[model samples]
Structures are given as structure tokens and as C-alpha cells.
Target: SFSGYLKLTDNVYIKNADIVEEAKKVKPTVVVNAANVYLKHGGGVAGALNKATNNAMQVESDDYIATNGPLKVGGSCVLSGHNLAKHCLHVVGPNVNKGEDIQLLKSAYENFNQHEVLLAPLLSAGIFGADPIHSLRVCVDTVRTNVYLAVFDKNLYDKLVSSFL
Candidate 1:
């Protein structure tokens, strides 16, 4: 069962819940995806969004036409009409070569914090395989809004609780 809430900073909270389900609670102005540098929806949350949206994510991404990325770790781009929320922010997570660069993730969080309600995941905890604690630390330290973090993994959730409580 989903359990407990950890209050971080002003308006920031961590909850143990399904990302999709938790996203609905906030009706987020923007939903941040842990994205790849190329902005492809190959795996992780991107893949889930693509499936849920009938591939609208990838289709809309292709239509961007303005730019495509090899966005370095922490670099981000925004897309509109995201299925779960009004906007989707894509940020590249860390990789083997670069290791975990907290600054980049923090930069993304800062940029996306322009909105009141934001939904985000534990970046790099999926495919990139970075430590969840480290990633959460960066997010906790950076964001400044009513940000909702979806914690699905029990281990990660426990680590979060231990870190905060």
C-alpha cells in the first residue's frame, strides 16, 4: 500500500503512489519526464506516456520541427498537450560517461518550477540506473513549488522516508 508523505520545502511533497494516479491529484500544470538526450520515448516513463497517449507524445515531439536534442544530462525541452497534464517537460538523466551531475537535474527542476503544480519522478532511477537517493536529494534541494513526486518503488520510498523522517 502507498504510505506516508514527506514534506520537503515550501509546497514540496513526496508521496508513495503510482505516478499516473498521483499525477491526477495535482492536475499538474506540467509533468516532467525523465527523458533521453535524443528526446526519444524508448523506455521508462516516456514509454508509458507514449502508450497511454496513443503515441501522441512521440508524434507531437516529431512535429516540434524547431529542434531535436541530444540534450546533455539535465537539459530539457517542453511539449504541449501531454495526456496526463497540460505540458510535458523532458530532461535527460545521467549516463555512464557523465555520471550523476546534480546541477543539470537541478537546472531542469528550476526551469520547470515556473508552474504552480508539477509532477515528477525519480530521475535516472530507471534506465540510467542512478541511485534513487542521490537523484531525490538533487530534486529536494532544487525545486520550489507544490511539486508532487511519484514514488512507486517500495525500496525507494523507504529510502526517502529514512532520508527525511
Candidate 2:
């Protein structure tokens, strides 16, 4: 379910914290793009979501980060951590419980384009008094056509989501 140069498929969902390391292991398109980092800052979820459903926007460059959870940054838009790899596009996801950062996540997803890539960890259902398996189940269900399910844990991976990563 992708558009243009973008391809969408449920593949792997890696933790943001492990993105740098994982990117290095995969040796993705990061380096070829540049040894630099790009920031696609925008208004909110609506802005980002619009871009994803095959809508157009003025992101300027696809090199950007969309997020709604814990950040390694502290300043206006600067995060305090250094990426072990180059090029990181952070796509934020919606938090359904109407939590604090739900809007932020929505903003990122709204503007997420099929061409743009995203990295994230499973939002632990336990945080919202939900079963982790079921939580992963729902997420995996919705985007099974165009998302990656990357679970670091081996045991849970065997039971909950797909039998394999």
C-alpha cells in the first residue's frame, strides 16, 4: 500500500533507542544520503498525517524526525544524543488513550509519507493498563500491510505478533 517511490509493508518496529545501532547493522540509505542529519519540523499530527495518506506537503526535505514519546533532546528542537549512524527519520505514532503526547504522535503520523521511513518500539500496553500482547496485536493488525514488527524480545515474538520478525 505505498505511493510513488515509497513502499509500505509491515516489516520491523525497532525501538527508537536502538535505531542508531540497528541502522548501522543494516547499513541502510543513511550514509548514501549524507553523514549529516536532517530535521523535518512541522506543526502537529494533522500536518504529518496529511502527508502520509498520499497527501502533499512542504516538508522541503524528507530528512526529518517525527516523535511523540521520550526524546533524547531537551532544547527547542535539539535532542541531546548523538546518532551512531547517519540519517534518521523519526515518525511519531498516535497514543490512543488520549495521553499527554498523543497529539504530537498524531502530528508525525499525519504527515508521514509512504516514501519516508520511521523507527519505533511497541508502545507498552502495560503503561495504559493493557496487555502487551494485545497492544502489539492491534498495532500489527492495522499496519500489517505496511509496517515492520521488530521485537527485541524473542519469547514474546514467538507468541503475540507474527511468529517471526
Candidate 3:
């Protein structure tokens, strides 16, 4: 269940609400997608948003990749959004086993934080394998204002909540 939030500086805070739900309710400036460099909607946050938008995002994602190229770690680009926010900022996080580069993760956030309201999930905290708290901190350290986050998993939420303490 979604609970409350913790302040991470005067301007940044995060809640336990799920991004899939919050993105709809608030319709943020742009919903951040934890995407692969290839923008594969196979699973994780990218897949969830693709499903939430009725597969429209997947199509747009494919177009974006086709027009541009593989989005590199720390790279970002906008995709058309619906059933969520009007813009999706896709960012790729580093793979953990490859000796993760925290800079790339923070740089990823830095690009999207250009706007005000960002619906951020813990990027790469899933299949790409980032330490949830470390991922959370990069979000905190880089994108510091009007930020919203989701943590649906109760155990992960607890670990995140305790990190704030």
C-alpha cells in the first residue's frame, strides 16, 4: 500500500505511491521511464508504462529509437505520452554487474530534471540491478524539486523509508 513521503532536502521529497497510479492522478510534467538503451518494453518500468498507456508508448519508443539511435546510459529523450503524462523522459541506467557508474545514473536524472514535476521510479532498481537506496539517492541528488516517486513493494518501501531516517 502507498504511504507517505520523506523530505530529501528543502525541495525534493518522495512518496510510497506507485508511479503507475500517481502518473495518472497527477499527470506530471513528464513521467520518467526506467528504460533500456534500446527502449525495449519487455519488462520493468518501461514495460509498465507501455502497458499503462495501452501500448502507445511502445510504438513511440520504437519510433524514437528508429529516428535516433540506441539511447546510451545517462542519455535521455522524450516520447509521446498518454494515460499518464504528456511527455515521457526515457533514461538508461548502468548495469550493476558491469561495475556500475553512479555518474551515469545521476546524469540520467540530470537530463530529465530540466522540468519541474517528475514522476520518478527508482531507475534500474529492478532487472538492471541497482541498489534501491543508491538509485534513490541519485534521484535525490540530481533532480531535487517537485519530484514524485513510487514504491509499491512493501519491503523495498521499508528499506527506502529507513534510509531517510
lDDT of each: 0.70, 0.32, 0.77
Query: Any idea what lDDT model 1 has?
Result: 0.70
Tell me which of candidates 2 and 3 scores higher on TM-score: 3
Over the stretch 123-158, how does candidate 3's per-residue lDDT look in tens digits?
778777888888887777777557767776778988
Off by over 4 Å in 2: 1-20, 29-86, 90-115, 124-130, 141-146, 162-165
The alpha-carbon deviation from the true structure for residue 46 of candidate 3, after best TM-score superposition, in angstroms, is 0.9
Is 1 or 3 the stronger prediction by lDDT? Answer: 3
What are the per-residue Cα lDDT tens digits for candidate 2 across 2-61?
111112234435232232334335433321110111233232322232233233222323
Which has the greatest lDDT?
3
Worst 10 residues of 1 by lDDT: 1-10
In candidate 3, how many Å is residue 54 off?
Answer: 1.3
**Deviation (Å) of 60 in candidate 2:** 20
Q: Which structure among the candidates has the greatest TM-score?
A: 3
lDDT of 3: 0.77
Assess candidate 1 and give its TM-score to the true structure.
0.82
Q: Rank by lDDT, descending?
A: 3, 1, 2
Q: TM-scores for all candidates?
A: 0.82, 0.36, 0.88
Model 2 residue 149 CA deviation in Å: 3.0
